[PDB]
Structure 1
Amino acid sequence: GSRRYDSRTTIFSPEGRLYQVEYALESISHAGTAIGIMASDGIVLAAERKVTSTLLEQDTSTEKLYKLNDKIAVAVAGLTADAEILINTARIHAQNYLKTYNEDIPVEILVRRLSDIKQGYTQHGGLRPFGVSFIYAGYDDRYGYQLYTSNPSGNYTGWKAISVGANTSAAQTLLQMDYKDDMKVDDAIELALKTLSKTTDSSALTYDRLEFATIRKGANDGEVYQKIFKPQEIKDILVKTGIT
């Protein structure tokens, strides 16, 4: 029968590793780097567009930064198509929480739910894992500004600063060397770009190869703003931090 053609995607190696999860993490290591940095007064998400062209329309384009809520967002690393399946279920989980409780979903509860869906693909069903690693940047009134990470295993963790995809070893060393706890958002913007500018496998780091997002409050509001940077704004900040 069919037995002959089954890859068996949900078994252990003799070492007790999950083959398909290990190979998916391998896939993701080739993907455009994404960096999250949490400050005292906000969060920063930066990501390197993998492969471009003079003809790729960048104004209409979104391959790495997605809004999950008005308070939550994700940086993606890996298969885009896989990410969009997970992103769409997460957007719905948030709206179910809001309908049931009449409160916006806590960031950890959304993250745990996605992470549990990914775990499922690891343990039953015999389908390939989602070849995706997420950085979540959210805000809620319990834990304030939060930054989490999730990978094909279904494992999630919380960070002050993190990278996924290409050159995470290099990126994590550099972040850990120049990150202080009393940092301001404007400083985190600068740190995030420098780290990308040093791990890039490309000649330079131009505006047409970057996605950028921030989650800043207002003293003149008391509510939280998600600003996904438009190409011209990424070009402006790129000069201000001294990369022209």
Structure 2
Amino acid sequence: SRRYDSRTTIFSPEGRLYQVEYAMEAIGHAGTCLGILANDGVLLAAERRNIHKLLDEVFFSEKIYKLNEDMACSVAGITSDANVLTNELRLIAQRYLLQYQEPIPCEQLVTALCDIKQAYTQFGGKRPFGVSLLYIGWDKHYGFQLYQSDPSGNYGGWKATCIGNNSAAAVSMLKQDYKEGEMTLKSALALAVKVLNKTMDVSKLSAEKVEIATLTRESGKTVIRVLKQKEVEQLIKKHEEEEAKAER
């Protein structure tokens, strides 16, 4: 029995978890996913990996998941393990709504799932979830927020972050253009396209390869929408003309 055991919840000589770090390698192969914060709203931008001629396209989104009335998340890593985690996030958000009769704060929902992901790394002898999650939402305590999640159960509140393929190069590119406390949603969408175009395997950029979703508070209500192809096409062309205007 112990001969066939892989030993997942065990420390290494250097003081680190192997199965967690190997799960971190799994996310680095997945599609590029970035989310950035603005003054009037907050948005997510993800690289769609499911690209084929004979795909049906039924769902509203591929990697953007709706969790709450005021909250949404994005996925980087294994799609199957993500479907379990996103379903759990929807349950925790509803348990809080049943108990307190008010929407769950953004930080409380992120920490709740990260407690479960930490449990898998400490006890159980099972493989950890190889999924990194980017959360966007609004609460009455702090407002518009952005969060990053790790397989170890590690969370962090960001203003501009990226996870997935070419994550190290993209986060440095986001560090170059971002302006603190002055960025609007209009300039944020232009910044997101700028990063995705440069940090990608197949360049030029088409509407089918990318997926952008926005979260904005309108008339005292949170509005979460996935931008359609025609809306995305305009954002690419606005950056495409900026490429031509650069040579002058």
TM-score (norm 1): 0.95
Q: Which residue of 1 aligns with 2:188?
A: 188
1:116-171 Cα deviation digits (max 9, x unpaired): 11101100001100010000001001010010101101000010100011111110
Deviation at 1:223, TM superposition (A): 1.8
Q: CA RMSD in A?
A: 1.5
Residues in 1 aligned to 2:227 and 2:65: alpha-carbon distance in whole angstroms: 12
SS in 1 for 2:23: helix
CA distance, structure 2, for counterparts of residue 198 and residue 243 of structure 1: 15
Matched ranges for 1:91-170 at <5 A: 91-170=90-169
The structural deviation recorded for 1:222 is: 2.3
- Residue 216 of structure 1 corresponds to 216
The runs of at least 4 consecutive aligned structure 1 residues that moved more than 4 Å come to: none
1:235 Cα deviation after fit: 2.4
Q: CA deviation at 1:4?
A: 1.0
Contact kept, 8 Å, 1:93 with 1:110, in 2: the verdict is yes
- Output the amino acid matched with 1:192: A
1:196-235 correspondence to structure 2 within 5 Å:
196-218=196-218, 221-235=219-233
- AA at the equivalent of 2:140: D
Q: What secondary structure sits across from 2:211 in the alignment?
A: strand
- TM-superposed CA distance for 1:243, in Å, is 6.5
Check the 8 A contact 2:75/2:133 in 1, yes or no: yes
Structure 1: distance between partners of 2:58 and 2:185:
25
| Cα distance, 1:232–1:91 mapped onto 2, change above 3 Å | same
Contact 2:136 2:145 in 1 (8 A): yes
Instruction: Give how far 1:51 is off.
Output: 4.7
**Number of residue-to-residue matches in the alignment:** 241
CA shift digits 1:5-32 (9 cap, x unpaired): 1001111110011000000000100110
Q: Which whole-Å CA distance do the structure 1 matches of 2:58 and 2:240 have between them?
A: 24
Distance 2:113 2:204 in 1: 35
TM-fit CA distance, 1:70: 1.6
Deviation at 1:211, TM superposition (A): 1.2
Relative to 1, partners in 2 of residues 1:66 and 1:184: Cα closer, same or farther, differing over 3 Å?
Answer: same
Deviation, 1:65, is 0.7
Question: Could you tell me how far apart the structure 2 residues matched to 1:178 and 1:96 are?
Answer: 40
Matched letter for residue 201 of structure 2: D
**CA distance in structure 2 between the partners assigned to 1:81 and 1:71 by the alignment:** 25
- AA matched with 1:183: M
Cα deviation code 1:25-51 (max 9, x no counterpart): 001001101111001111110001125
**Contact 2:60–2:226 (Cα < 8 Å) also in 1:** no
User: Partners of 1:24 and 1:142 in 2: how far apart?
Assistant: 34
Q: Which amino acid aligns with 1:217?
A: R
Name the CA distance, whole Å, in 2 between partners of 1:61 and 1:5.
Answer: 43
Match of 2:246 in 1: none
TM-score, reference length from structure 2: 0.93
Rounded to whole Å, the distance in 2 between the matches of 1:207 and 1:81 is 25
Find the counterpart in structure 2 of residue 74 from structure 1.
73
Query: Which of 220, 234, 239 is matched with 2:237 structurally?
Result: 239
Matched with 1:57 is 56
Please state whether the residue corresponding to 1:206 is helix, strand or coil: coil
